Design a protein around this nucleic acid. Structure first.
Ligand SMILES: [Mg+2]
Ligand SMILES: [Zn+2]
Ligand SMILES: [Zn+2]
Ligand SMILES: [Zn+2]
Lengths: 45, 49, 48, 66, 263, 113, 144, 84, 49
RNA sequence: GUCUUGGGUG
């Protein structure tokens, strides 16, 4: 579905709103979303 | 609530000094000038403006 | 200021502030005025 | 944080001199002499390098989060 | 009648004495070289992957502050005068930066030499980040640790220092005249004696000190000007001086054009 | 949020003329010129050039506000001369002086090689 | 917590009087006294009963009422905006619905961005609270 | 009953600052509501400045009723009060 | 809000009638109000916050 | 959307 990342072991994975909130590789408790796919522009000013 | 109360059509911000303003002039930020308004009755002398 | 207020009115007195401010500010812009640590120092005889 | 590219006051490029400055300080040269050799002559450019605190070393110690 | 006397001339700086010109002319030249000589600088940054500790606009500000070779920037068009909707080569130079720590130990430094020119209005000699030597590493941009990556596509455009200091070809234009205060344009603060307490100008030996018998002269105007232009490598010192002169000439020509075509 | 654009200093809009001339009726043969999108660089140059002509009796300029990029210039001349003509003459003279200066600087730089 | 600026003491143009102070625009352009700002918004799901709870979800107009006047087009399918997206004032960064007690049976409890602030989303955190219900923290970033 | 005859009117013959301010405000509001204008309008379009022009030319058709502390009052037309 | 509009301008505390005065508007860039420097005495104001 | 507490500014 949508990409996440572990908070302890930096593992990447993807959960689908029905699994519990957890990491696969270690089983850690806090996860962070992944960077968006859109393109971001800055003015360099 | 009766001797003093909060009022509409007011603004507040930090003040700065300007050697090039007249004594009875105040410099008003553009954003405040656009947020605040004055109701001006349309007449045959102000319809174009 | 009081004299110009009483003789010429409030409008001319208000414009007096601006005239004096502009002339003096231009002259001081091209003259300059500063203050330093040396302006608080008295010579040896005065210290004695 | 990390050495600024330009001098704030005048705009000279100081971002390419931090490593040379550290190497000069390693071999014993005192700070004024190292700043002289890097040809930083105006005290604005000199205080750019002399007062820099390099915090990126401290920030890099926290593990990459991806 | 105007005269130039070069005293020192290397690639980055030129030291010259200017003479038989009005002070307004010399100061206008100083101001023009500081503010109105076009250069090239990164004006648009596109972040693909930035997992470094630094923020996106921090890195963008630093990239905008990087000097780039601007020799041919005058054969280029301002990106606001080009009829392309999205950017194009007539008015931009596209650079790439890709950096990535490989392995799991030490710090990888990201330098300005790692910027790579991909497109640009060839064969114009613009766009490259300026290197001091063949072995220069350039400016420090960021630092990377394990698995941290930086992937950036920068656009460079033509601009002047009025818009933003990053387009300034000059750092500091030293400028002085009348080392002995013969014209009495300053009035020295002192405690005991104004001659002992004030250091001499570095061009004091270039002019005769006033004689004790001399009286004040009310005909003398400033006539000799000692100025030292320094550059950031984007332009050379002689190039900065000549293009400042040309920019002033074309500003005057613009005024002349409007005056004549208002008749 | 109230900061104007840094290119409005020099980029002339389409509804704003570069130059606008009005006469000062109080004194004879005088004109007031407003230069848009310019600053002290052109103003002081022109002022000190014009102040040295015999036929120019009054010349001055001011920048009424530093936050707005224009200046206004008052210039008077004698009976025969027109202030406008003195203005083209000053522009041409400064152009020639800069051209001579450029030629001599380039020659000097070549000799230094 | 400061910077060594080069300071002149002068009555230069009159704009530094009465504790005003003139600053170099070029030095500002080169990074003098420039700072990053981080604001973090928080929100979680409550339990109003047995099977009555709130949900993080992008609220469709049909099933929801009293929707905020901001735009919802920035939320992913999980009701959370993704890091790297520019956000203006009044934009929704956490979509949430509160069920209507006994279609069209939900009220919204969405968290907008502050009406004054701009910026770019930095770090959208997601965990569970003390009671095991979903918990979200969203940190914005900007430069002043 | 409470009106005073035009002969025994013992208040000041001069328009006070408050009377002038209120008279100008009322005239400006009236003119901004497309009321007829007594002066010849030459250049100015702002109703307040037109009202000032009317006040100077003694052509404002209004009346000040000056109440005394005992409840009686005096009536003065704007054209007969003296404007500084 | 436009140039020359009369607006009431005020600093607290308002200890006397000259702490509240009517000014003509001048619309300007940046976020601070602007005052001529001779009126900072009746307002008892300065430009440090 | 409300009440208290705390830290501050002129
Ligand atoms: Mg104060
Ligand atoms: Zn994990
Ligand atoms: Zn410096
Ligand atoms: Zn193009």
């Amino acid at each position: 579905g949508v990409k996440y990342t572990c908070g302890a072991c930096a593992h990447n994975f993807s959960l689908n709103k029905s699994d519990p909130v957890r990491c696969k590789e270690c089983g850690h408790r806090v996860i962070y979303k992944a960077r968006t796919k859109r393109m971001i522009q800055f003015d360099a000013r | 609530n009766l001797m003093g109360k909060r009022v509409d059509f007011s603004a507040r911000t930090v003040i700065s000094g300007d050697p090039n303003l007249e004594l009875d002039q105040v410099g008003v930020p553009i954003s405040i000038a656009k947020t605040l308004s004055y109701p001006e009755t349309v007449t045959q002398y102000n319809i174009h403006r | 200021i009081h004299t110009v207020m009483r003789e010429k009115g409030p409008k001319i007195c208000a414009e007096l502030f601006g005239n004096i401010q502009k002339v003096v500010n231009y002259w001081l812009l091209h003259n300059g005025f500063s203050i330093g640590i040396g302006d608080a120092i008295a010579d040896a005889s005065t210290m004695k | 944080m990390i050495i600024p590219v330009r001098c704030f006051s005048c705009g000279k490029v100081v971002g390419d001199k931090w490593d040379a400055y550290l190497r000069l300080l390693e071999e014993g040269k005192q700070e004024g002499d190292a700043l002289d050799e890097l040809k930083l002559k105006r005290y604005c450019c000199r205080r750019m390098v002399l007062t820099h605190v390099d915090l990126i070393e401290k920030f890099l110690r926290y593990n990459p989060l991806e | 009648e105007p005269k130039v006397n070069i005293i020192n001339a290397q690639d980055d700086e030129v030291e010259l004495m200017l003479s038989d010109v009005n002070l307004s002319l010399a100061n206008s030249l100083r101001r023009t070289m500081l503010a109105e000589v076009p250069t090239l600088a990164i004006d648009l940054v596109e972040i693909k992957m930035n997992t470094s500790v630094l923020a996106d606009e921090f890195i963008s500000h630093r990239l905008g502050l990087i000097p780039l070779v601007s020799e041919d920037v005058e054969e280029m068009k301002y990106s606001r005068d080009c009829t392309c909707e999205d950017y194009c080569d007539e008015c931009s130079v596209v650079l790439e930066l890709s950096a990535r720590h490989e392995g799991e130990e030490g710090t990888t430094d990201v330098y300005s030499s790692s910027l790579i020119k991909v497109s640009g209005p060839g064969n114009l000699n613009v766009g490259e980040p300026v290197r001091r030597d063949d072995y220069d590493q350039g400016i420090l941009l960021c630092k990377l640790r394990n698995h941290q990556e930086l992937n950036i596509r920068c656009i460079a455009k033509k601009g002047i220092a009025k818009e933003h200091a990053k387009w300034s070809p000059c750092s500091a234009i030293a400028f002085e005249y009348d080392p002995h205060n013969k014209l009495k344009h300053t009035d020295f603060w002192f405690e005991v004696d104004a001659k002992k307490e004030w250091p001499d100008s570095k061009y004091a030996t270039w002019e005769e000190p006033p004689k004790p018998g001399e009286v004040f002269d009310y005909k003398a105007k400033p006539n000799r000007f000692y100025m030292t232009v320094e550059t950031t490598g984007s332009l050379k010192a002689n190039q900065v001086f000549s293009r400042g002169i040309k920019t002033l000439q074309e500003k005057l020509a613009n005024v002349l054009f409007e005056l004549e075509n208002s008749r | 949020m109230n900061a104007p654009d840094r290119f409005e200093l020099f980029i002339l809009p389409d509804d704003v003329p570069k130059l606008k001339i009005t006469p000062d009726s109080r004194v004879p043969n005088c004109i007031i010129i407003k230069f848009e999108r310019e600053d002290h660089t052109l103003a002081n140059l022109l002022r000190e050039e014009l102040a040295l002509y015999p036929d120019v009796t009054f010349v001055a300029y001011k920048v009424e506000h530093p936050l707005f990029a224009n200046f206004v210039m008052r210039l008077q001349t004698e009976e025969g001369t027109r202030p406008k003509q003195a203005l083209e003459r000053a522009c041409a003279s400064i152009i020639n002086k800069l051209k001579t200066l450029d030629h001599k600087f380039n020659e000097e730089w070549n000799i230094k090689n | 917590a400061g910077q060594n600026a080069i300071v002149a003491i002068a009555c230069y143009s009159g704009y530094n009087q009465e504790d005003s102070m003139i600053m170099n625009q070029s030095s500002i352009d080169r990074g003098l006294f420039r700072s990053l700002f981080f604001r973090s918004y928080m929100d979680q799901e409550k339990r109003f009963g047995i099977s009555i709870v709130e949900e993080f979800e992008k609220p469709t107009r049909a099933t929801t009422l009293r929707l905020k006047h901001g735009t919802y087009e920035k939320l992913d399918e999980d009701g959370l905006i993704a890091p790297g997206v520019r956000v203006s004032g009044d934009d929704i960064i956490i979509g949430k619905t509160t069920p209507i007690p006994p279609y069209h049976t939900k009220r919204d409890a969405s968290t907008p961005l502050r009406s004054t602030e701009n910026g770019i989303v930095d770090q959208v955190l997601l965990t569970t609270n003390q009671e095991g219900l979903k918990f979200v923290k969203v940190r914005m970033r900007t430069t002043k | 009953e409470l009106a005073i005859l035009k002969e025994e009117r013992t208040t000041t013959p001069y328009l006070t600052k408050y009377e002038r301010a209120r008279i100008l405000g009322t005239r400006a509001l009236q003119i901004s509501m497309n009321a007829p204008v007594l002066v010849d309008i030459e250049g100015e379009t702002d109703p307040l400045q037109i009202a000032m022009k009317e006040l100077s030319q003694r052509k404002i058709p209004l009346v000040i009723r000056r109440y005394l502390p005992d409840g009686s009052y005096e009536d003065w037309g704007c054209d007969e009060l003296i404007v500084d | 809000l436009m140039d020359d509009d009369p607006v009431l301008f005020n600093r607290q505390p308002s200890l006397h009638k000259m702490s509240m005065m009517a000014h003509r508007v001048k619309v300007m860039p940046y976020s601070t109000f602007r005052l001529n420097l001779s009126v900072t005495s009746p307002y008892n104001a300065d430009f440090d916050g």
